[PDB]
Subunit: 296 residues, 4 copies
C-alpha cells in the first residue's frame, strides 16, 4: 500500500557526513561508506541527519551528499534525506531540494532550541509534509530538541498522507505502541539502546548510529527477531551493547567517525562544536568494538 519497510527500509544508518583532511565535504568517501553500509546489510541510509552533522553542513553540502549517496546506492537502498531544522521556511526549501535530487523520503526532526508550542510543531510538520510528495518520518527526540512531539500531535499528524512514521528517540514505548496500533504510523528505533524493545512493540526497524560499525549484526538481529528467534536477537543485542555503551561516552558523531577510522574507513573528523575522539577515547572505543567483534 504504502509499504514502509520497502519504501524506507528496515535497517538504516544515520550516516556520518565524511569530511576531507581539509574538512571539506568528501563525497567520494560518502559513496564508499554508503556502499559499505548497504553491503553490510543496511537497506536504507539517512543522510544529513544529526549524526550526518546537519548542524554544521551547508544546504549545498547536504545536496551534494545526497546526490553522491543516491548515485552510489540509490538503486539498491532507500536514501532518506534529513530535511528539518528549527526554521519552517528553511525546512520546506531543504525538503523541496531533497525531493528535486531524488531522495526517497525525508526525516524531519522536531524543531529544536526554540520550543515552539505543539500547535507550532504541528503547523511546522504539515507545512514540510505539504512541500513535497515524499514519504516523511517525524523524528521525536525531546532529549535534543527540548520539546517532545506530544502523542496528540503525533496522532493529528498521522492523518497527513505524507507523514508515514516516526523515528523515535523519546523511548515512550507504551505510547508509541498505541500510536502505531491506532494510526498505522511506522516506528523506527532511533536509539540503539532500544532497538530490541522497539521491535517487540512492532517497530519496522532501526535508524541506527551503531550500524556504522555493526550493521551485519543489526541485520542479523532483525532477521532473528523477524523469524521469532528472540533468544538469538537478544544475544546479538547483548553482543553489540558495548557499542551503545561507547555511544553514551562519545555521542554518535564522535563515535561513528572514530569507529569507522578504527575499522580502516577514514571518514575524517567532526566539525566544531563536535570534536574527534581523543587518544584515550579511541582506546576505550577500540576495546568496546573488540568486545562487539567489530574490530580485531
Amino acid at each position: 500500500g504504502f509499504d514502509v519497510a520497502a519504501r524506507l527500509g528496515t535497517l538504516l544508518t544515520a550516516m556520518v557526513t565524511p569530511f576531507s583532511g581539509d574538512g571539506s565535504l568528501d563525497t567520494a568517501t560518502a559513496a564508499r561508506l554508503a556502499n559499505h553500509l548497504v553491503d553490510q546489510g543496511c537497506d536504507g541510509l539517512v543522510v544529513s541527519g544529526t549524526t550526518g552533522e546537519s548542524p554544521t553542513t551547508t544546504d549545498g553540502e547536504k545536496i551534494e551528499l545526497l546526490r553522491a549517496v543516491l548515485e552510489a546506492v540509490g538503486d539498491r537502498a532507500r536514501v532518506i534525506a534529513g530535511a528539518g531544522t528549527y526554521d519552517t521556511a528553511h525546512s520546506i526549501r531543504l525538503a523541496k531540494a531533497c525531493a528535486a535530487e531524488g531522495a526517497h523520503g525525508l526525516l524531519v526532526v522536531t524543531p529544536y532550541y526554540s520550543k515552539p508550542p505543539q500547535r507550532g510543531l504541528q503547523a511546522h510538520f504539515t507545512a514540510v509534509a505539504d512541500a513535497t510528495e515524499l514519504p516523511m518520518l517525524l523524528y521525536d527526540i525531546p532529549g535534543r530538541s527540548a520539546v517532545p512531539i506530544e502523542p496528540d500531535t503525533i496522532r493529528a499528524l498521522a492523518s497527513h498522507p505524507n507523514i508515514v512514521g516516526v523515528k523515535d528517540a523519546k523511548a515512550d514505548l507504551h505510547s508509541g505502541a498505541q500510536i502505531m496500533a491506532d494510526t498505522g504510523l511506522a516506528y523506527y528505533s532511533g536509539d540503539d539502546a532500544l532497538n530490541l524493545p522497539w521491535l517487540a512493540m512492532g517497530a519496522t526497524g532501526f535508524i541506527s548510529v551503531i550500524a556504522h560499525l555493526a550493521a551485519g549484526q543489526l541485520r542479523e538481529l532483525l532477521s532473528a527477531f523477524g523469524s521469532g528467534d528472540i533468544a538469538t536477537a537478544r544475544k546479538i543485542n547483548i553482543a553489540v551493547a558495548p557499542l551503545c555503551n561507547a555511544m553514551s561516552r562519545l555521542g554518535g558523531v564522535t563515535l561513528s567517525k572514530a569507529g569507522l577510522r578504527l575499522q580502516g574507513i577514514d571518514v575524517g573528523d567532526p566539525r566544531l562544536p563536535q570534536v574527534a575522539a581523543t587518544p584515550e577515547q579511541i582506546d576505550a572505543l577500540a576495546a568496546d568494538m573488540r568486545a562487539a567483534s567489530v574490530l580485531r
Copy 2:
C-alpha cells in the same frame, strides 16, 4: 534455583483490601488472592506499594500474608513486600515474613532518605542476610528518589539470596546486560514495559493491571514465550487503556476502583491515598470496557 517456579511468571502487586471502616479485610484478601490466581497469576506480591505498605502496620502485613498463604499458597507463590527506608525495620519485617512462610521477598530501594550506593548495598545485604528466602530488589527511583545503580545491582547479584530485580527504572539496555552477566531474573515492575521487558529476557511481570486483566497478561506471557510476538503485541495493545488509566490514577486508586467496578469490592485506599472520584470511575470504566475487562 528456578526463579519462574519459585517466584512465578505472572504476579499481581496485590492491593490490601480494607473494610468500610478502613480496617484490614483478610476475608476479601483471601477471596481476591483466589480470584487473581484463578485468573492466571502464579504468584502474588503482598504488602508492596500497591498493597499500601506505607499505611498498614507490621501486624496487618503479617495478618494479610497469612490469609493469602492460607488461600493460595499451595497453588501460587506468595512473595512478601519487606523493605522500607529503615534497615532494622526491613530486617524485622523480612524475618516476620519468613516466619509466616512467605515464599520470597520483594525489597524496595530505601526511599526518601537517599542513602548512597554503599548504604543501599549494606541495606540490601543485611536484609538478604536476615532470612533464607529468595529476594527480589525493587528498583524504582521514580518513587524512591535513588536508583540501584548497575554496579550496586551487580555487586548484590552474588548474594545467594538475591535472585532478581523487579524493575521500574526502565533501563532496558542496562537490565539486559545485568541479566546476561549475572543471571539475575528480571520482572517487569511497570505494566507499560511488560512487553519490552519480555523481549529483553524478563522472567515475567509483577503487575498492577493484573488486578483487572490477569487472564490477558497470562495470554500475553504465553503468546510471547510460545514465540508468537504478534499476538503478544496485540494483547499488550488490548490492555493498554488500563495502563493509561493507571497513569491518571496511580495503581492503588486504580486497582481498588477497578476491582469494585468488576464486582470485587476491596474498599478504599488509606490516606494519603484516595478513592477514585465519580468522574475517575467513569473514565476508568471506559478503559476497562476498552480492555474487555468490564460489562
Copy 3:
C-alpha cells in the same frame, strides 16, 4: 496575629539525632548539641526531621528526643517537631504526640514514595493540621518525596488556620514568592544552597543543615540581609559555600554527623541505610570546613 519569626524562629537547624556507639538514642548528647546550636545563633531547631534520621528512629525515640530537646533549650529557642510520614494516620499520632510533649510547631513533609495525588496530599496535610492546635509547616521536597506540593495545593492549604508556612526545597522561587504575596504563608529556605535567594524573595529564614557547623555565620548572613547589607550577606554565603558543596557529596546526615565530630562534638554515626563518612570523606570535609572557617 501569628508572628512566624517569633513563634518558629529565623535560624533553625534541621538537627541530627545523636546515637550512642551501640546505635541507641543519645539524649544527653542531643541536649548538648541543642544547647550548642542555640548558643551559636539558632533561635529554633527542627527535631526528628530528615536530617534527624526520622526514617530510622522509632516514635518512642522521637518523643524522647523531643523532650530532651525542649528541656534543654525550649525556654529560649523554638522546638519544631518533624511529624510527617507517608502514612496519614501515623502522621496524626505523631503530630498529637509531639503536641502533647510541648513541641512549639510541626514540620510535615510531603508523603514520600507512594506518590499520592494532589487531592491526597491536601486531605493528608489537612488531617494533620486538624489533629492539634500547633502551627504547622509544609515541607515541599519533591527531590526526596517524588511528588511536589503543587502551588494550587499549597494555596488551598494556606487556607487552614494552623498551616503557617513552607519549608522549601523545591526551589521554585518565583512560585513561592507569589504564594507568599498572595497567602501570607511564611517560607523557610530548606536547602542551604538557596538560603540567600530565598531571603531575597521574602523567606523568613532558614531551616538549615549546614547550621550544624556554621550557625554563627548563617546568623550573621540573616542579620546582614535584614539590615540590607546584601554585599555582606553574599560574602558570608560565599564563605559557607564549601559546606554546601560537602553536603552535595555526602548528604546532610553523613555531613552533619562527621562535621560535628570534626568540631569536637561527637554525635555518633548514622543508622543504616545511612552511613558514616569514610576516612577519605572525612578528610575532604575537613578541607571544606577549614575553607568555611568552621574548623581549625
Copy 4:
C-alpha cells in the same frame, strides 16, 4: 572593563518585528528599540532567541542590528546574538556583527547536537577569538540540551573577551561561586529569577518581560541597588503575571502579542513559532492589566 557600562543593566531580549508578509520590519525594530530604551533599558539584545534567531537569515540579522544601532546605539548598548550550533557559522556571524558596530555578543550554548564540554569550550573560544567584542555566554540547557558546566565556564572566564554569563540554568549557588572566583558578570536570563539573581550579585537582566514592563524592571534594579529589597520584592511581585503569561505562551508569542496589546504592533512570529490565539490574548491582557502595563 565595566560590564554594567559596556553591556548594560537592563536589556530586553528584543523581538524582531516582521511585516504582514513575514518580511523583516526594520522601521518598527527601530521604533521598538527607541521605545524600550525610553522605558528604561540601557541595552538591548538583538537577534537572540526572543529575536527569532532561528528563523531569520544572516542578512536579516545584520540589517536589524544596523537599524537598531542607528536607532539607539548612541544611547544604549546593542548586543548582537551570534551563536548557533555551528561554530564556523557563529564565527561568521560574530565577525559580521562586530563589523556592523555591535557593542557586544551574546553566544548561546550550541543547541540540539549536544557537543561534549570540550567541544563547547573550543566553540566559545573560537567565537571569542573571532572579534574584539565583549562576549556573554548564554547558559540555557533547557533549550540547548546541554549546560555549560561550571568547569567549562571557569576555563572560559580566562578568555579576555568572555566577560559574563546570561544565565537561564538557575544554578544560583554555582553562579555565585563562579562570580566570586572569576569576576564574570551574570545577567538574569530568566525573568522568574531576576530578583534571586540580583541577590547573588547579578549585574542586571537580559529580559523578555522588559518588552512590556521595562520601566518596572528598571525601578526594580534601582530599588535593589539602593538597598530597598522590600520595594524590589514588591515590584517583582507586581510583574509576576507577565512571567506567568510567559510560561503559558513562551517569550516570542508573549512579546509580540503583548506589544500589540500595548499599541506597538511588531507583527507575528515566524513558523514554527505562532501568534497568540484570541483566548491567549485575553488571558495575556488580564496579566498585563494585573501588572499595570495595560489599561
